């Protein structure tokens, strides 16, 4: 048995900022502070204006990224689980959930802009991090790329759910995991955009 009246609900994922890629300079903007984020996670009611393609999102314990592609805001299952996302009308249920792909998605919030999937086949990629660094990555397989400049794994913490882009700024993948050796990230693992496209039909 258990006491049902005291069973808690998981909070919603909350948009707390964005990585601004609109100009000549990439930079992180915060749109909600910690107290606001906590309240909004509980109510699921977020009246803030959303802008841009890459959102900074938070659960109760973690902060990471979510990326709009083709009208869906995507992130990683290992970060978001099955959580709703906060919105002006209250919590919004996931439109896609796939633990096997490590992928989730919600309808893209009004005001967001979407990336278009890459069609050029370029293996010269750019990873956008949660601190708005744009890091060159050479594609090494369907779901792997090598960092041109290896970094401590700390550099990539919080970037899960962010985009890998081709030279034309189209979406190639969603960053999911670092391949690390003695704390140094030499490569990255990602969910290829073709996998998102199959999920969408
Ligand atoms: C991302 O979720 C994030 O931004 N999280 C912060 C809290 C909000 C995070 C970004 C990492 C820089 N991703 C992860 O933590 C992923 C997820 C994927 C499912 C489990 C976790 C683990 N993870 C990783 O990136 C890990 N990497 C690995 O487990 C790789 N293995 C190794 O690096 C390794 C090293 N020595 C011996 C054996 N293995 C594997 C390699 C094969 C492909 C998948 C990843 C860590 C260790 C956290 C970087
Ligand atoms: Zn492209």
Author numbering: 980 to 1180
The publication says:
The NS3/4A protease also hydrolyzes two human proteins, TRIF and MAVS, which are part of the innate immune system, thereby confounding the innate immune response to viral infection. In this study, we report that four chemically representative protease inhibitors – telaprevir, danoprevir, vaniprevir and MK-5172 – exhibit distinct susceptibilities to the protease variants R155K, A156T and D168A. To elucidate the underlying mechanism by which chemically diverse inhibitors bind to the wild-type protease and drug-resistant variants, crystal structures were determined for 16 inhibitor-protease complexes. These complexes include wild-type protease and resistant variants R155K, D168A and A156T each bound to telaprevir, danoprevir, vaniprevir and MK-5172, with resolutions ranging from 1.10–2.50 Å; S139A protease variants were used except for telaprevir, which requires covalent bond formation with the serine 139 for efficient binding.
These rearrangements modulated the charge landscape along the protease surface, disrupting interactions with the adjacent P2 cyclopentylproline and P4 cyclohexylalanine moieties of telaprevir, consistent with previous modeling studies. Thus, while telaprevir's flexibility allows adaptation to D168A, it cannot accommodate the disruption by R155K or A156T.
